[PDB]
Every structure is written in C-alpha cells, then in structure tokens.
Amino acid sequence: LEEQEEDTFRELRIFLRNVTHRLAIDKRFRVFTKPVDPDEVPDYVTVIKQPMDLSSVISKIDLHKYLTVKDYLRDIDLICSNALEYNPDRDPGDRLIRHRACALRDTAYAIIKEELDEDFEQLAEEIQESRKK
C-alpha cells in the first residue's frame, strides 16, 4: 500500500546520512561541522539570520525534515551562502573559508549528480507534492 512512500523516504534518509558523513569527515569542511560560535564571532548573528552546519543537517535528516534531495541541497546551499555572505575577502583566512564553502557546495552537488537516481529523486519530490494536498 502507501508503505511504498515511507520506503522511499527511508532510503532517501540512508542516502543523505552517507553523503553527509562523507562531507563531515572531509578535512576541508571541518569549519562547517559545528555551528558558528557567537563567543568567537560576536557579529555573526547580526549578518546571518538562518544558521546552518553539517551537524544540524544530520539532526534534520534523523528527524525527517528532508523529504527530497532538493530540500537537503537547500541546506547545503545555505551553509555555503551564509559563509560567502558573512565572510569578507580581506586576508588569506577569509579566502580559505570562502573557497571551502564553494567546495562544500560543489562536492555535495557532484556526489548527488553521480550517485542519485533521477527517477528516485523525482518520486520523492512528487510524493511530497501529493502530501501537500
């Protein structure tokens, strides 16, 4: 019956956990594995309204907040876009974190492009569509 829809989302979460783990253990992305700490960056909350990082993405997977890879990528994109919005481009550290943000985005999209079945993704998007009704 409609068990098939839950099976789709279970398989989607298992896939997302795997992709996210590969990102989180990549040394390039260490800086994105924990939330930005206001004690170390006191002006961060004055720039960035919707913080995101890989530990929060893992929590969101487990609490069923991603029904599609589209929505998952929205949060990977948000990690990157927060980093490019917040961080200036004035010293070598700034350039490094900005290049890392783009690489996080590019790496996640490339894994998805390579490993995600398009008909599987499309089914997840269309179930989400039917549940909007």
């Binding site: 960056v41 720039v47 919005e85 200036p88 700034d94």
Partner: peptide, 7 residues
C-alpha cells in the same frame, strides 16, 4: 560582510 573570523 561581517568582520570575519579569527579576530
């Protein structure tokens, strides 16, 4: 931008 990290 904000002021950046490491400061």
């Amino acid at each position: 931008s904000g002021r950046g990290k490491g400061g």
